[PDB]
Ligand binder design. Structure first.
Ligand SMILES: C[As](C)(=O)[O-]
Ligand SMILES: C[As](C)(=O)[O-]
Ligand SMILES: [Zn+2]
Ligand SMILES: [Zn+2]
Ligand SMILES: [Zn+2]
Ligand SMILES: [Zn+2]
Lengths: 329, 331
């Protein structure tokens, strides 16, 4: 209610500071980092790259990241704990479920998924005692039956704990609306929900409608663009053609519509990546050398150039994440 | 060559004894036992049940089991080591890949799959130093393109190390033939391959043809029969409608055809199971209270009553697993 759980323990709301609400130390799959660490060079190579990247972000103003890596995205909470300490940046760990649930997970019911999410929030992740401070879910272009089950369990978990829900959206079929519908069917308050990856579209009518219903809007893939890489069908299919300025202009567009309190901005960056083509991390790094420092080094000065008040920018990067992460019913 | 790697270390071929070549301590998914141990009551409860069942198997004559639980089936090699030590039963761990590879696995090349399998065979599983003694692969009714990749990687890993390959088959479209074709195209000897879940069909002609080519035949699901309960469609869809005696007669049939040296017999049992419906483990346990002791307590006596000679039954349970598991790159 006035404290948030991090991988180093509980902190006061005021200690969060500049917060990136959608990031990753490592994007992977369940158990993979432990079974084949040499895929990332080594576990130590990954730690070192991540510590280095978080220090760069820290030097640029970032105090806290929310790692929205879930069980099926290969979340390694011990990795998060080590990297948090070494880089001296707060990290909030996630529960929930992304788009790659294993057979065991796909066989579970809403009540079983709720119990799993609650365990990671209320008791801790694995045998670490480290508690989730956020619930991450995801749907495809069209939501599948199992995805709905995850969203219902997430709502049930949120209603029992006050922990907020962040979503992954994709495609053209306005996924956020499908999700919002399920959430409200479970009686979940929109103010507890961040509809993520919303900068992926230029449909401003879609975002304002969601915001007008009280939903937080996640503009979290700002640096993700092919800044001179069309000779990679893999990149264009997982990055895009809209420049980071185009994505950044949605932030100001929503501000101008009166929704500054509903905006959450992030990089959706990572330091290791195994769930796409080999070495794609190198391609991402070539495009955005700033890493998680992209938002404070590039996006923030840009919005200020376009006339955005310091009061507003401070509110988006500090107040909004604080209000959102603070457990509330 | 003369040594097999177990979760407690290397052992001489001659120490393996009565070996069950297709079993599981726990059937799950990657990372699941560590993330939600309470699904199995507790990790501690799972250990206690596994030790209990392994000791009963040991009492009935079993000295070694091959745990063919892969990465994607949630293999926990530390769990295996712990139950092996407590029960005093050798356990051989697996590498390879079953039917549920994650997105990371599905994105990898044959080269990378091969390297991962080789890592688990040559250096160790995770950070434990425990090396895999078998490669486990699987295909569905109609083999998919990624499954082919996994089989090719397994062939390449086998050729580099001499470690054998065990397969999962399912469906009616003779998957073992699809598998054999891929292995041989990579240059793998059928003598390094056990085509598993072969007792799922009564097609004896399909089996003798495989055995004639030099393949080991895994009759590994003998107690998996839904006979005794018809009010469980989940149990009929995963177990069977044929009797265990029927499955066990396939053993005698293949011996009678002259293929005693190619036969590998097992229960394909487990002590925990999260891959299916909740408490499906309870259903299996009610059908087969003997667990992994089903083969030595029921199937071996049944075969003696069928007039299968003792020396033959011993060759199947002792000599055939030893020859199979012993790392071999002929000549
Ligand atoms: C690239 As993602 C769906 O793990 O934020
Ligand atoms: C039931 As199985 C495919 O894990 O032997
Ligand atoms: Zn996402
Ligand atoms: Zn993400
Ligand atoms: Zn199988
Ligand atoms: Zn099996």
């Amino acid at each position: 209610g006035d404290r948030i759980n991090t991988v180093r323990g509980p902190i006061a709301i005021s200690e969060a500071g500049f917060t990136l609400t959608h990031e990753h130390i490592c994007g992977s799959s369940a158990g993979f980092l432990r079974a084949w660490p040499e895929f990332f060079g080594s576990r130590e190579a990954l730690v070192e790259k991540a510590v280095r990247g978080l220090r760069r972000a820290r030097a640029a103003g970032v105090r806290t990241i929310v790692d929205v890596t879930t069980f099926d995205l290969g979340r390694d909470v011990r990795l998060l704990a080590e990297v948090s300490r070494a880089a001296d940046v707060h990290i909030v760990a996630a529960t929930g479920m992304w788009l790659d649930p294993s057979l065991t997970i796909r066989m579970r019911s809403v009540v079983e998924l709720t119990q799993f999410f609650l365990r990671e929030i209320q008791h801790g992740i694995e045998d670490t005692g480290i508690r989730a401070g956020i619930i991450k879910v995801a749907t495809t272009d069209k939501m599948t039956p199992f995805q709905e089950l995850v969203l219902r369990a997430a709502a049930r978990a949120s209603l029992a704990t006050g922990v907020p829900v962040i979503t992954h959206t994709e495609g053209s079929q306005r996924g956020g609306e499908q999700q919002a519908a399920i959430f409200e069917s479970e009686g979940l308050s929109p103010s507890r929900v961040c509809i993520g990856h919303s900068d992926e579209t230029d449909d401003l009518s879609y975002l304002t409608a969601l915001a007008a219903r009280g939903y937080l809007i996640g503009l979290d893939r700002i640096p993700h663009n092919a800044i001179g890489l069309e000779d990679n069908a893999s990149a264009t299919a997982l990055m895009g053609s809209r420049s980071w300025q185009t994505r950044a202009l949605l932030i100001k567009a929503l501000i101008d519509q009166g929704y500054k309190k509903q905006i959450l901005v992030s990089n959706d960056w990572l330091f290791g990546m195994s769930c796409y083509v080999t070495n794609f991390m190198d391609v991402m790094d070539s495009v955005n050398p700033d890493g998680m420092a992209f938002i404070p080094l590039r996006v923030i000065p840009f919005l200020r150039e376009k006339g955005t008040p310091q009061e507003t920018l401070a509110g988006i990067t500090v107040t909004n994440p604080a209000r959102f992460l603070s457990p509330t019913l």
